[PDB]
Design a protein around this ligand. Structure first.
Ligand SMILES: Nc1ncnc2c1ncn2[C@@H]1O[C@H](COP(=O)(O)OP(=O)(O)NP(=O)(O)O)[C@@H](O)[C@H]1O
Ligand SMILES: Nc1ncnc2c1ncn2[C@@H]1O[C@H](COP(=O)(O)OP(=O)(O)NP(=O)(O)O)[C@@H](O)[C@H]1O
Ligand SMILES: [Mg+2]
Ligand SMILES: [Mg+2]
Ligand SMILES: [Zn+2]
Ligand SMILES: [Zn+2]
Ligand SMILES: [Zn+2]
Lengths: 193, 41, 340, 157, 175, 341, 154
DNA sequence: GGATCCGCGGCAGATCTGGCCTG
DNA sequence: GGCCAGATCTGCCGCGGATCC
C-alpha cells in the first residue's frame, strides 16, 4: 500500500490506462485494467506494477478553470521531472501545499510560483543568486527580474513561506528558463500563450 | 468501523461475502451472539 | 340384438358353466383378482373382437380352450364356437368352418378399457395409428390404399437413399394414393365431429373438438416439388399423409399438456360412445357395449351423468368395485359367477 | 460431536452459505483451533427519530444537524456510504405520509431499483436525483438506455 | 511480427487462429481481399461509399470526440442532427492545443442560432475541453448546452464514487 | 427432515398465500380439476426435483413469470430455497445467492408417486431398462460417466463396421473396458436391492415378488464378441453387450407384464417406490419427504387398510385423493385455495 | 458497406469467433486504418526437413533420445512450454475416428516408421477422449509388434 | 400341408431442449 | 457465449399368425 498523487494519464489503446504517480518514497509508473487527475489517492500496487485497490482522500473541485488547470498540469509535470526518491519526502508536502494554494487562492500563479521555486531549490536545481538571471545565474543577460524580483526570490529561497508570501504579494519565466537549462524542454510548455 | 473491519478480516481468514456477513451480523445481534456462543461451545 | 347365453371351458382362471345376462343395464361386482376382466375379455372374443398373446389365453398347464356364444339377432338366432391351442384359432359359424373376415360383417361389440387413455395422452404416432384404425373399421378401401401407399413410399425412399436415379413414376404413384387418402380422411372427419361434441356436452360441461393438420392440403405433387433441395439433402420424403397430426382440444387447448385424469377419461369415454353410435346408425342395429372399471377416477356428478346416459342403451354391462344404485347386480368370487 | 450441530445450524442460517458449505467450514475450523480462537478474540474488537442504528438511544446524527432536510434510505449500507460521503448537513414510504409534518422539502435517497420505482409511483416539496452519465471511463463502455436518457435529459448551461 | 499482430487484437486463441491461418492460405487471401476492399464523411464523419454518405446526399449539432462515439450515439437513435468530428482532445502533456485541433473547420459550419451538445469525455481533460469550447461559443454568440450529470441506469449507491453522488445531489430535479 | 412453509405466485392454476403441513401423516380432498396434482408438483419442483412437464407450460395463461418459495429445516439447520421460473430458464437462490442445480443433488429431497410408475412396470423392454438405469444413476455419477463412454464407443464401432474395414481389435478392447464395469455395478446393486423390496412388498399383499436380470455377456464381452463374428458380419451391428439386457418383475414366479391385474401392478409400483425411499433414507441418513398421489383409487378395502397402516410410521407424508382417510387431518382444495378447518 | 459485409463474413467464417465480436472488430478496424495494413503486412517458416513440423528456420527445435507422439501442434507447444523433459517430438495428423472417415492411411503413421533407429523409449502423450485411447491402443499394438517398450501418462 | 402375405415389437440413428463452464 | 448431455421422434428389419392352393 502506498499514498501519492495522480500526475499522469496516458490512455492505452487496449482500453487500459497508464498511470504516473509519485509518493514520499519516490516516483513510479503503474497500469490499470480497463483515480481522477490531481487527486491525493492511497493505492495498493501489485507487480510495470498493476494497481489493485484505490482509495480517494480528497478532491480539488476548483481546478476545472482552464488557466488553473494548465498551471496545475505545469506544476505536476515539473514536480514529476524533479521527483527524485531522495527529494520525494520534501517535494510531496510541497506539492500538496502548492496544489491547495492554487485551488484556494484567488490568483493561482502566486502559490504556483511559490511552490515551484521551493521545489526547484529542494530538487538540486537551486539557482545561483550570488538584475537578469541567466541559466540560474544573475547578470546582464536573461529576463530582467529587477531589484524587487531579486529580493522576493532571495526571501523565498531563504525565509519560510509564511513571510515569503508578503514579499511576492516574471519569476516564473526565470524558473522556467532554469528548469529548461537543467532538464531540457517541457511537453506542456505549448499550452501557455 | 473497527469492529466491522475486524469481522470482515476474521471472515476472510471473497471480501464481498465477508462484508455482507459482517453487516448482517452487526444488524442481527441475536444471531451474532448465538454464533459467538457456538464458537465458544 | 341380445346375447342370450355364453359358455366356456379352460379360459384364463374362469371356472363357470353358463352366464345369462338380462336385457337392459347390468352390473358386475368383485374384489381385486377375481375375474371381471377375464369374463369381459372372453365375451369380447366370443363375438369376434380383437385382443394378450394368443398362447397366453389358455389356463395354466393345459392345451385346449373352448368358447361358445348364442346370440339371437332381429332376423334370427345363430351360434358360434372358438377353439384355441397350439395349432391356432378354429372359428366355425353354426357348424360350418369359416374365416374371421366373414365375422367382420357382423355387428359385434365395443369394449372400453383403461387402454384408451393413451390415444389421448400419447405421442403423435399413437394418435395417428388410432385414427387410422378407427377409419379402417368402417371401410375396406382404406386398408388397401394404406398398404399401397406404404409400399410405394418404401420403394421411393430406398431408390432415393442409394445414390440417384430417375424419380418420375414413384412420385406419380405416391400422389395418386395420397390424394385419395387425404380426401377420405377429410370426408370422415367432417361427419365424426358433431356427434362427439354432442355426446361430450351431454356427459360434461366443457367443449371438445378435433383438429387435423395437413402438410399437403392442395396436392402431393406440388408439396414434393417445393422441397426438392432439402429432400435430396436429408434423404427422406418430408411431405405426405404419413406426417399429419391429430390433436384433441378441451376449451381450445391441447389435451395432452393441460387436461387432468378425469377430463381425459371423460373424453375417451365420449370417443368410444360416439364410435358406438356411429356403428349403430351404420350397420343397422347398435352393437353390445361393454364397459370395464367404469367409475374409479370420477366424482359424484360425473358418475351420475355416466349412469344416466348408459341407462337408455338397449343393452350394456358394467364392471367395477362398487355396485351402482338401482340396477341388477351379480357378484364374482374366485372365478365363479353367482346371481340372485 | 453433538456440539458442532448447533454451530453448523447457526452458520447454515445466514444467507449465502449452503448446508454443505457450512459443514465444510465447521470441519476446517475443527482442527484449526488457532484461528478459531483468533476469530473469537477478534469478534469483540435504531432511534425512532432517525431510523439509524447506533450505540445508545440517540444516534450521532441526533447527537450539528438540521431537521429541515430528511432523506429516506433503502438500506443502511447506503447510509454508511453517504456518511463516508458527507454532503448533507440535514438529518438522516408507507409511513412517509404521516411523517410529512415538520418537513418542508423531502429528500429521496432511495436507490433506483424497481421496488424504489414502484414506491415512488405509489407515493405520487419533493426532490429526486437526476438520470445522467457517470464520470471517467469510456463512452464505448456504456448502455443504450443511459445514452438515450442523457440525450433527452440534456440540460442547458 | 505475427505474435505481435495477433496480440494487438482486443493469447491461446490468437495463436490457434494464427496457426490455422498459416494452414489455411485461402482464408488469408480472402481476408486480404476484404481488407483491400475496405481500404470518414466530409461533413458527418461516419462511413460512406466514396465521398458523401447516403444521408448527406440540421438545426441540431452534436460535438463528439471520436467516430466510435458518433456511431454509438447514432445507434442510440435519439439524435437526428449533424455532427462535427474533432481530431481528439486538448492535452498539454501530449502537446495538443488550439494549434492542433480543427477549430477553423468547426467555425466554417457554425451559425448564430444553433445548439451544440457537449459530449466530451467525463475527465478533467474532457471537462476542460467542454468549458473551453463553451466559452468560445458564448464569445461567438451561440447557445451552450451540457448533457446531464448524474447516476447511471442500473447503478448501485454503495459502489458509486463520491463525485458522481455529489453531482447527483447538486443537480437534483423536482418531481 | 421437515417442511415448514410453501408459498407460490402464478404457478399453474394455483391461487393461495401459504400452506403449513403438520408433522406426520396428512391428507388432501378435492373434486376433479381443483389443483391437488398441481400443488404436489409444485412442492416436488420447489424441493429440487424433476417435473416431467415442459418448463414453458408451468405458468398461467397470459403471465410470463412464476415464483416458488419453500422453507425446510433438517437435522443440521434451517435454510430457504427459491425458484424463479420464466422465459429465460430456471434459476435457484439458496439463502439468497445463485446456486447450480447440481448442488441440490446432495440434499435429501423428496420422492413422488404417480401412475407413470404403473405405466413403466407394464411397459416394453426398453422402458424397463431405462427405468433401471435411471434408478441406479441416483446413487453414483461414475455410472453415468461409464454409460456415456460406452454409448460413444458403441457408436464408433458400429459406424466402423457399417462400411469398409480398418483396425477393429482396438475398439473391441475399448468397449470391453467399460462393459465389465457396468455389469459388475449392476450385479452389486441388484444384490443389495432385492431383499428390501421383498420385505417391503411382504407387508402389503400375500403373494411373492422378485427380480430377474438375464445377461447376454456374462463371462466377458471379448469372449462373446469373438463367438458371434458371422452374425455381426451378416447383420452389420453389434449384438452383444449391456445395451441388450432384460429386466423382468415376477409375481409368484411368472412375468408381471402378462399375468397381472391392475391392483397387483399398482401394489408392485408402490412397493418399488417405498423400497427406493427406504434405501435413499439409509444412504443419506435422513429419509426424504414422501408425496403420494391417488393413494387408494383402484384398490379394495383390505389393500387400502394395509396402505394406511404402513404410512403411519413414517416421519412425514402427504396423501391426496377424492376421499378422506379415517382418523387423519384433512384439508380441502376448491378452485386453487387450500383452507384447513 | 459491402466490403464491411464481406469482412464480417470472413471474420465469422474463421473458427473461435463471435458474430457480435466479428462486427465489433470490423467497426474497430474501420476506426483504425493503419492497423489494417499493419496486419496485412504481418500476415505474410515451413515443414521441417526431417520431422516435418513447422520450423522457425530449417529444422524444428525438436531435432536441434526420447520420443513422444502428439495429436497436433497445440498440445506440442503446451507440453514443451512446461518443459519437464527434452527429446525428439512427433506430431500426428489428428485423432482416429471412423464417423467422418479418418483411417490409418489418412494419418502420418508411415512417416513415423522411418526413424525408429536409435530409439530406446517412446511415450504416447494422447488426449483423454475415446478416440485418443483407441489411437493409443493401436499404436501400442503396432510398436509391440515391432518391439519397443512403451509408456503413457497417468 | 406348403407358401406368400400382413402386421407389430424391437433397435439404431438424427433432432432438439435446457443446463453448464470459460471468460 | 459456445459446447455437451439426454430425452423424443422417424423409419427399417426380422418374426408370428392368418390365408390360399
Ligand atoms: N393364464 C392364466 N391362467 C391362470 N390364472 C390366470 C391366468 N391369467 C391370469 N390369471 C389369474 O387371474 C388374475 C387376474 O384376473 P383379472 O381378471 O385380471 O381380475 P380383475 O377382477 O379384473 N382384477 P382388478 O382389475 O385388479 O380389480 C391373475 O392375478 C391370476 O391370479
Ligand atoms: N397452465 C395452466 N394454467 C391454468 N389452468 C391450468 C393450467 N394447466 C392446467 N390447468 C387447469 O387445471 C386443472 C387441472 O388441475 P389438476 O391439478 O390436474 O387437478 P386434479 O385435482 O389433480 N384433478 P383430477 O386428478 O382429475 O381428479 C384443469 O381445470 C386445467 O384446465
Ligand atoms: Mg381387471
Ligand atoms: Mg390429478
Ligand atoms: Zn437519531
Ligand atoms: Zn455524411
Ligand atoms: Zn525437425
Amino acid at each position: 500500500l502506498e499514498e501519492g498523487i495522480v500526475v499522469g494519464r496516458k490512455p492505452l489503446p487496449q482500453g487500459d490506462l497508464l498511470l504516473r504517480l509519485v509518493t514520499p518514497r519516490g516516483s513510479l509508473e503503474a497500469v490499470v485494467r480497463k483515480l481522477s487527475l490531481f487527486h491525493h489517492v492511497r493505492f495498493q500496487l501489485y507487480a510495470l506494477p498493476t494497481l489493485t485497490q484505490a482509495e480517494l482522500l480528497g478532491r480539488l473541485h476548483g481546478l476545472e478553470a482552464p488557466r488553473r488547470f494548465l498551471l496545475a498540469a505545469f506544476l505536476a509535470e515539473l514536480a514529476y521531472r524533479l521527483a527524485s526518491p531522495e527529494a520525494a519526502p520534501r517535494i510531496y508536502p510541497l506539492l500538496v501545499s502548492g496544489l491547495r494554494g492554487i485551488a484556494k487562492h484567488e490568483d493561482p500563479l502566486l502559490p504556483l510560483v511559490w511552490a515551484g521555486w521551493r521545489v526547484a531549490k529542494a530538487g538540486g536545481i537551486g539557482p545561483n543568486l550570488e538584475l537578469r538571471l541567466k541559466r540560474g545565474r544573475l547578470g546582464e543577460e536573461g529576463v530582467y527580474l529587477g531589484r524587487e524580483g531579486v529580493e522576493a526570490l532571495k526571501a523565498t529561497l531563504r525565509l519560510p513561506g509564511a513571510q515569503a508570501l508578503p514579499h511576492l504579494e516574471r519569476l516564473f519565466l526565470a524558473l522556467k528558463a532554469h528548469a529548461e537549462e537543467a532538464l531540457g524542454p517541457l511537453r506542456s510548455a505549448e499550452a501557455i500563450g | 468501523p473497527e469492529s466491522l473491519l475486524k469481522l470482515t478480516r476474521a471472515l476472510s481468514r471473497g471480501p464481498k461475502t465477508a462484508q455482507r456477513l459482517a453487516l448482517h451480523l452487526a444488524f442481527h445481534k441475536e444471531e451474532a451472539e448465538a454464533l459467538a456462543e457456538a464458537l465458544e461451545g | 340384438m341380445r346375447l342370450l347365453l355364453f359358455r366356456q371351458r379352460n379360459f384364463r382362471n374362469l371356472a363357470l358353466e353358463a352366464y345369462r345376462p338380462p336385457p337392459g343395464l347390468s352390473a358386475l361386482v368383485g374384489a381385486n383378482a377375481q375375474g371381471k376382466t377375464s369374463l369381459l375379455l372372453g365375451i369380447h372374443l366370443a363375438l369376434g373382437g380383437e385382443v394378450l398373446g394368443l398362447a397366453d389365453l389358455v389356463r395354466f398347464g393345459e392345451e385346449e380352450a373352448w368358447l361358445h356364444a348364442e346370440v339371437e339377432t332381429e332376423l334370427g338366432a345363430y351360434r358360434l364356437e372358438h377353439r384355441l391351442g397350439p395349432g391356432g384359432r378354429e372359428v366355425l359359424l353354426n357348424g360350418k368352418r369359416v374365416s374371421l373376415r366373414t365375422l367382420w360383417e357382423l355387428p359385434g361389440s365395443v369394449l372400453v378399457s383403461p387402454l384408451d387413455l393413451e390415444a389421448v395422452l400419447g405421442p403423435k404416432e399413437e394418435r395417428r395409428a388410432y385414427l387410422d384404425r378407427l377409419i379402417a373399421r368402417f371401410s375396406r378401401r382404406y386398408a388397401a390404399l394404406l398398404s399401397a401407399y406404404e409400399k410405394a413410399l418404401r420403394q421411393r425412399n430406398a431408390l432415393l437413399k442409394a445414390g440417384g436415379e430417375g424419380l418420375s413414376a414413384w412420385d406419380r404413384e405416391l400422389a395418386r394414393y395420397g390424394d385419395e387418402i387425404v380426401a377420405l380422411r377429410r370426408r370422415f372427419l367432417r361427419r365424426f365431429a358433431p356427434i362427439l361434441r354432442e355426446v361430450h356436452a351431454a356427459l360434461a360441461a366443457k367443449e371438445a373438438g378435433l383438429r387435423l393438420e395437413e402438410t399437403a392440403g392442395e396436392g402431393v405433387l406440388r408439396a414434393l416439388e417445393a422441397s426438392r433441395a432439402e429432400e435430396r439433402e436429408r434423404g427422406q420424403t418430408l411431405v405426405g399423409p404419413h406426417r399429419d397430426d391429430l390433436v384433441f382440444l378441451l376449451e381450445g387447448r391441447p389435451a395432452h399438456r393441460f387436461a387432468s385424469r378425469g377430463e381425459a377419461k371423460t373424453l375417451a369415454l365420449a370417443l368410444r360412445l360416439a364410435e358406438h353410435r356411429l356403428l349403430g346408425e351404420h350397420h343397422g342395429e347398435p352393437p353390445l357395449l361393454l364397459v370395464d372399471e367404469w367409475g374409479e377416477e370420477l366424482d359424484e356428478a360425473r358418475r351420475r351423468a355416466v349412469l344416466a346416459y348408459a341407462q337408455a342403451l338397449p343393452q350394456a354391462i358394467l364392471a367395477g368395485l362398487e355396485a351402482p344404485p338401482g340396477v341388477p347386480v351379480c357378484s364374482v368370487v374366485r372365478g365363479v359367477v353367482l346371481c340372485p | 460431536p453433538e456440539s458442532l450441530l448447533k454451530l453448523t445450524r447457526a452458520l447454515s442460517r445466514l444467507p449465502g452459505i449452503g448446508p454443505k458449505t457450512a459443514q465444510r467450514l465447521a470441519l476446517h475450523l475443527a482442527f484449526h483451533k488457532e484461528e478459531a480462537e483468533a476469530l473469537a478474540e477478534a469478534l469483540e474488537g435504531a432511534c425512532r427519530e432517525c431510523g439509524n442504528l447506533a450505540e445508545g438511544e440517540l444516534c450521532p446524527i441526533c447527537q450539528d444537524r438540521d431537521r429541515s432536510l430528511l432523506a429516506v434510505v433503502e438500506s443502511v449500507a447506503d447510509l454508511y456510504a453517504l456518511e463516508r460521503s458527507g454532503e448533507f448537513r440535514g438529518l438522516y414510504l408507507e409511513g412517509l405520509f404521516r411523517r410529512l409534518e415538520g418537513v418542508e422539502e423531502v429528500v429521496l435517497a432511495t436507490s433506483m431499483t424497481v421496488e424504489g420505482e414502484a414506491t415512488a409511483l405509489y407515493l405520487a416539496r419533493v426532490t429526486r436525483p437526476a438520470y445522467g452519465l457517470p464520470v471517467g471511463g469510456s463512452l464505448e463502455y456504456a448502455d443504450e438506455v443511459t445514452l438515450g436518457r442523457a440525450l433527452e435529459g440534456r440540460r442547458p448551461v
